[PDB]
Design a protein around this ligand. Structure first.
Ligand SMILES: [Mg+2]
Ligand SMILES: [Mg+2]
Ligand SMILES: [Mg+2]
Ligand SMILES: [Mg+2]
Ligand SMILES: [Mg+2]
Ligand SMILES: [Mg+2]
Lengths: 125, 25, 129, 81, 206, 96, 87, 217, 97
RNA sequence: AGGGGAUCGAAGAUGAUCAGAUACCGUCGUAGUCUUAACCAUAAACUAUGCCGACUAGGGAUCGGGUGGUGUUUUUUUAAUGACCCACUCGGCACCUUACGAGAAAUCAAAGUCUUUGGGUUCUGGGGGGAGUAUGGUCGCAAGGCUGAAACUUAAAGGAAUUG
């Protein structure tokens, strides 16, 4: 029955996102870290927050944790988010410049008359 | 008390009386 | 069965206007309906209406400009005296400065305003505002 | 659509509707100039016939009534109107 | 009216059909019928991409009419529109709402996420129905990336596209971003295509 | 058509129907049936003299728990026996 | 509305819907007013002058605003061949 | 003092919008009552009724007080507000704020000819709340407000002086009678009249033109 | 007040269907109103099945099965926990699971 | 009033239960349950929603009829037909989403197109009891049906929904 109060959880949620690069996965270091970086009121609460914070380090270590995003996680996501596939991005080259469609889209191209390479495949049903 | 038990009670009462009014008719 | 084609034509227009339609189709569109449309169009409540000649009874497609509030019929066509026009107008119209009570009188279908200056009276057909 | 030209419906839209519900109601039925397999005599047969129409030479059958359109007797040429 | 350059260029229609944006939905409602070019066998309908392009160009002119780019909110809730909206928000002001809308972001003038846009753009009226309904209390226009089966209530401008394809959704947002930048001194070089590849608006995994 | 007829020649159906349903009015029924003149202590009169027959103290209805101190009076015009209140603090002594 | 010596006496004249000529009232919080940018040559938004449509909340709620904008833009030339009168 | 959190408030506080009818013209939603006070200063206030609303709980009956407050001067502006608070005084304060948010403009017309200033309603209108239906008829000059004392005062805080009235349903319900009348008076700009048939150039919104000063950094 | 659009049954176009007898108390309930469950149970068991397979001649023997349609009155279905009275808006849910 | 009468089963019998149990529960069981020839004419006879007509919003499914696909399907390696699929349409039983709109609300595609009140028409109601009672009439073999008050009494009865 050791469920941790949101004041403990939101305190970790107020610590990791700003000090992840300098924290450690060791609780003993963390509570000594919690001494000066965090201005807490009681020693019992000091150890409780350090324990949850250390547990968050393990959870963070094995993949990102939802709801908490440290600073270096932001750049880690954005570099992955700047992906621009240099080919295959609907730039033709599927059949080396002759896109494929059905009869109706083909006539559609003719309803607009635009000059575009094309093809036609049978359907049914 | 349903009105059908009122209905059934009143039917008996309405029909013991056309028998007692018959002894004078 | 139908009893008042003018009532059905006026009701069809009214439902169309409340739905924002800019036109409505009317069947069977008698010539009392046409005369009633003509007075409404003369005062600007509707636009151009066109009579489709089927060989049976007629159709009308009325263009609505959105200026119509409530076109309605008064049934039965009560015999209204020339002095009893004011009573109908007060009961049927929203204000004295606008709206019309269309009367079928011996001089033809006409609004209560024109029928007052021709000094004729008949039976009340319907209203428009 | 709240705005449409009820006086000029598209021909595909009117062909979709019931015959009594077009802009001006009319029949979708037609007449056939059926030809007897043997003789050259031309008989004018209603599409929705509903009677077993008979030619002169082919005095057995020329069409067969059904629920709607009449069924031609699988050996007869025809042209509309 | 509109000058001749704004017509559907073949290069733009090259990829507009490639992303299968023409692939409409099996079910079409009476408010999306005009965009139904035809019905293919197997029941998939086809959209007239000329309607898609012309409606897209209209929305850009509507978009590039608010004096401020910071109050043109682009809404997405589906996971496919998340990257499309955010990178739509990068090129213009276009404050984005990706993920959850937080009901009461247009009313409830005291919250942190309370905003007062002059225009809301939704990637999907069905999924962003909360955003659309929230926008109908405050007299805000709505531009929707509707499909043939999507609702049209409180949708002032509708761009017909394929809501079931990540390629289509990313392309529509990309094109919308390009036209609004063209309708300002940002990409004044109208003739040549945009330098950035449209793929960066597409969905991202994992 | 919402119930009632409308036609110009329907005034008989309208008037007869109204005359039939008017009897549902308790105040109109009583005047037309003339129950007050026929069956009532006062023959449709605002006042009536009488002869005091006895003095009664009646228990008021609940919840009041009081005594009302009325008098039983024999009417002079028709002879009907009624009971009548004596409204004041006392004044029963006056009646005798 | 006027009075005897002219001199219009009316708080304001409400804007009418561009699709139905309906009065847009003060508490019509679903009624929008769309502004479409004017465009000169080479497509410049030239901010300041717009083509403006007012859509009543009734049309938006009933879901015919998207078609109403199509018809009104087609009428003013904003769109070219999207809206067809006959359907 | 007052710090504007809304674009409308920022314009009104800065002075870019100097009259309320500009808000009504574009149907801008007012959220800060400071906007109404800045544009309608002399807005006299009255309370029509205070009634207790009770909720049954495990221990006893919880009581709260519901206040109906009417704002509006005698120059064609009216508001109405329904607020329930734990105490009467608080219900009045929040009742006044709610009524100021719901300020709407009304229409004054002539029963007869267009002589003098408008005195009556421009058109007979009607509002419904609950089962109560309130109908307002334009009246000749000098007829006064022929209405129940509650609806009569709501019409005095409207600027109307001549109007007839009819009613339906449980008019003894004051909140529904006030809401029904309040709906009725607001419909007076809802109705379309021949004088308003003329087209207008549909002017731009204040939130569009003065969008530089509004929504600061 | 009307608790259900389909009053308590499935009858729109009949005026009278027929009665059927509840399998638990023999009450007469109309066939449309009756709660119906189909019992599709193996002939022997899911526990004794192994025992009867070892002791069976014909080393491969298709195990037969029992079928019977069960009709319950409203009371018996509730008492036996077949229906489980639901909320005002959940009772509109007509899905089998 | 004949026939027939297996089962179930007002009445009745009886066994338990219960303080009592002329009830629920168990076992019998007459009338009835079935049929023929005649009666009665009532049901929560219900969708508690008269009938005819017009209009107003989106969808899918289904029953019956019809129309069209160079559609699938068969025994003669295809034909017609049947069955099936798709797209329409007419009529019907309904259903789903929404609130134009209505309503007191529950809810309603009608219970909408109603103080902006009029398509045509029939029936019924006027606070709760007394009371569908008394009497009269009429129908019926009877049961009872239809018609149907008054004296008197009464500040409420009631509908929908909310918290407990
Ligand atoms: Mg109950
Ligand atoms: Mg039945
Ligand atoms: Mg009944
Ligand atoms: Mg059926
Ligand atoms: Mg009464
Ligand atoms: Mg009574």
């Amino acid at each position: 029955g050791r469920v941790r109060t949101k004041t403990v959880k939101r305190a970790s949620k107020a610590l990791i996102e700003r000090y992840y690069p300098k924290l450690t996965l060791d609780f003993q270091t963390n509570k000594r870290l919690c001494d000066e970086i965090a201005t807490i009121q009681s020693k019992r609460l000091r150890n409780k927050i350090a324990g949850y914070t250390t547990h968050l380090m393990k959870r963070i270590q094995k993949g990102p944790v939802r709801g908490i995003s440290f600073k270096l996680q932001e750049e880690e996501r954005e570099r992955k988010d700047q992906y621009v596939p240099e080919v295959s991005a609907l730039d033709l080259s599927r059949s080396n410049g002759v896109l494929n469609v059905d009869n109706q889209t083909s006539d559609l191209v003719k309803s607009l008359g635009l000059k575009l390479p094309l093809s036609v495949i049978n359907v049914s049903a | 008390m349903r009105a059908k038990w009122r209905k059934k009670r009143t039917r008996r009462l309405k029909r013991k009386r056309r028998k007692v009014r018959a002894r004078s008719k | 069965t139908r009893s008042s084609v003018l009532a059905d034509a006026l009701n069809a227009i009214n439902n169309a206007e409340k739905t924002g339609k800019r036109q409505v189709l009317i069947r069977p569109s008698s010539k009392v309906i046409i005369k009633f449309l003509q007075v409404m169009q003369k005062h600007g409540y509707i636009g151009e209406f066109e009579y489709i000649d089927d060989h049976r009874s007629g159709k009308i497609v009325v263009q609505l400009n959105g200026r119509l509030n409530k076109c309605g019929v008064i049934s039965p066509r009560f015999n209204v005296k020339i002095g009893d026009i004011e009573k109908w107008t007060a009961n049927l119209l929203p204000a004295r400065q606008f709206g019309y009570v269309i009367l079928t009188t011996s001089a033809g279908i006409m609004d209560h305003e024109e029928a007052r200056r021709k000094h004729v009276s008949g039976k009340i057909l319907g209203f428009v505002y | 659509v709240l705005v449409q030209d009820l006086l000029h419906p598209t021909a595909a839209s009117e062909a979709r509707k019931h015959k009594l519900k077009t802009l001006v109601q009319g029949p979708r039925s037609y007449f056939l100039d059926v030809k007897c397999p043997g003789c050259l005599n031309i008989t004018t047969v209603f599409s929705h016939a509903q009677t077993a129409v008979t030619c002169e030479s082919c005095s057995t059958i020329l069409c067969t009534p059904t629920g709607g359109k009449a069924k031609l007797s699988e050996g007869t040429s025809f042209r509309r109107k | 009216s509109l000058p001749a350059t704004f017509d559907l260029t073949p290069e733009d229609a090259q990829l507009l059909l490639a992303a299968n944006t023409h692939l409409g939905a099996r079910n079409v409602q009476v408010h999306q019928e005009p965009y139904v070019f035809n019905a293919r066998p197997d029941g998939v309908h086809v959209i007239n991409v000329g309607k898609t392009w012309e409606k897209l160009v209209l929305a850009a002119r509507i978009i590039a009419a608010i004096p401020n780019p910071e109050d043109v909110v682009a809404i997405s809730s589906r996971t496919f529109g998340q990257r499309a909206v955010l990178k739509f928000a990068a090129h213009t002001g276009a404050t984005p709402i990706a993920g959850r809308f937080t009901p009461g972001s247009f009313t409830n003038y005291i919250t942190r996420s309370f905003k007062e846009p002059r225009l809301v753009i939704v990637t999907d009226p069905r999924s962003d129905a909360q955003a659309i309904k929230e926008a109908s209390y405050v007299n805000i226009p709505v531009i929707a990336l509707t499909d043939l089966d999507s609702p049209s209530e409180f949708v002032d401008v509708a761009i017909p596209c394929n809501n079931r394809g990540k390629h289509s959704i990313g392309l529509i947002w990309y094109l919308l971003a390009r036209e609004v930048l063209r309708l300002r001194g940002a990409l004044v070089d109208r003739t040549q295509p945009w330098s950035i590849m449209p793929d960066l608006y597409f969905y991202r995994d994992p | 058509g919402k119930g009632k007829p409308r036609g110009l020649n329907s005034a008989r159906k309208l008037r007869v129907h109204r005359r039939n349903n008017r009897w549902a009015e308790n105040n109109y029924k009583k005047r037309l049936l003339g129950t007050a003149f026929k069956s009532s202590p006062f023959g449709g009169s605002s006042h009536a003299k009488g002869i005091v027959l006895e003095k009664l103290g009646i228990e008021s209805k609940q919840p009041n728990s009081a005594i009302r101190k009325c008098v039983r009076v024999q009417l002079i015009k028709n002879g009907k026996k009624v009971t009548a209140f004596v409204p004041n603090d006392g004044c029963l002594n006056f009646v005798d | 509305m006027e009075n005897d010596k002219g001199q219009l006496v009316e708080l304001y004249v409400p804007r009418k819907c561009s699709a139905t000529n309906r009065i847009i009232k003060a508490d019509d919080h679903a009624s929008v007013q769309i502004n479409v940018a004017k465009v000169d040559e080479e497509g410049r938004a030239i901010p300041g002058e717009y083509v403006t449509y007012a859509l009543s909340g009734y049309v938006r709620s009933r879901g015919e605003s998207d078609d109403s904008l199509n018809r009104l833009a087609q009428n003013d030339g904003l769109l070219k061949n999207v809206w067809s009168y006959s359907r | 003092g007052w710090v504007p959190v809304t674009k409308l408030g920022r314009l009104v506080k800065a002075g870019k919008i100097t009259t309320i009818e500009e808000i009504f013209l574009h149907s801008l939603p007012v959220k800060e009552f400071q906007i109404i006070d800045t544009l309608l200063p002399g807005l006299q206030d009255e309370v029509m009724n205070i009634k207790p609303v009770q909720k049954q709980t495990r221990a006893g009956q919880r009581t709260r007080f519901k206040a109906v407050v009417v704002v509006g001067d005698s120059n064609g502006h009216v508001g109405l507000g329904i607020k329930t608070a734990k105490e009467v005084a608080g219900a009045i304060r929040a009742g006044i704020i709610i009524a100021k948010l719901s300020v709407i403009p009304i229409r004054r017309g002539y029963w007869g000819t267009n002589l003098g200033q408008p005195h009556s309603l421009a058109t007979k209108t009607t509002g419904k709340c609950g089962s109560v239906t309130v109908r307002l008829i334009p009246a000749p000059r000098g007829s006064g407000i022929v209405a129940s004392p509650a609806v009569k005062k709501l019409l005095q805080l409207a600027g109307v002086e001549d109007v007839y009235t009819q009613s339906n349903g449980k008019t003894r319900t004051l909140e529904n009678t006030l809401k029904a009348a309040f709906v009725a008076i607001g419909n007076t700009y809802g109705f379309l009249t021949p004088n308003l048939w003329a087209e207008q150039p549909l002017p731009v919104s204040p939130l569009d033109i003065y969008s530089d000063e509004a929504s600061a950094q | 007040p009307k608790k259900r659009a389909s009053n308590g049954r499935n009858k729109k176009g009949r005026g009278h269907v027929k009665p059927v007898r509840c399998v638990n108390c023999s009450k007469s309930i109309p066939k449309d109103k009756a709660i119906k469950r189909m019992a599709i149970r193996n002939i022997v068991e899911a526990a004794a099945v192994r025992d009867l397979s070892e002791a069976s001649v014909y080393p491969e023997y298709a195990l037969p099965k029992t079928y019977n349609k069960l009709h319950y009155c409203v009371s018996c279905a509730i008492h036996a926990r077949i229906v489980r009275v639901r909320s005002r808006e959940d009772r509109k849910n007509r899905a089998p699971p």
